[PDB]
C-alpha cells in the first residue's frame, strides 16, 4: 500500500482528458 493515485489501465481519464483523432 503506497497510496498510489491510480493502478491498472482504464484510459487514464483521471490523469487528463482523453485525446481523440479526426473522429
Swiss-Prot record:
Q: Which organism is it from?
A: Homo sapiens
Protein's recorded name = Keratin, type I cytoskeletal 19
Q: Organism classification, top ranks?
A: Eukaryota, Metazoa, Chordata, Craniata, Vertebrata
PTM annotation (Phosphoserine): residues:
9, 17
- Residues where Asymmetric dimethylarginine is found: 19
* Residue numbers bearing the Omega-N-methylarginine modification: 2, 19
Provide the domain comment.
Answer: This keratin differs from all other IF proteins in lacking the C-terminal tail domain.
Say which family it is in.
Belongs to the intermediate filament family.
* Highest rank taxon of the organism: Eukaryota
Give the protein's function: Involved in the organization of myofibers. Together with KRT8, helps to link the contractile apparatus to dystrophin at the costameres of striated muscle.
Q: In which tissues is it expressed?
A: Expressed in a defined zone of basal keratinocytes in the deep outer root sheath of hair follicles. Also observed in sweat gland and mammary gland ductal and secretory cells, bile ducts, gastrointestinal tract, bladder urothelium, oral epithelia, esophagus, ectocervical epithelium (at protein level). Expressed in epidermal basal cells, in nipple epidermis and a defined region of the hair follicle. Also seen in a subset of vascular wall cells in both the veins and artery of human umbilical cord, and in umbilical cord vascular smooth muscle.
Q: What else is known?
A: There are two types of cytoskeletal and microfibrillar keratin: I (acidic; 40-55 kDa) and II (neutral to basic; 56-70 kDa).
The record's note on quaternary structure and interaction partners says: Heterotetramer of two type I and two type II keratins. Interacts with PNN and the actin-binding domain of DMD. Interacts with HCV core protein.
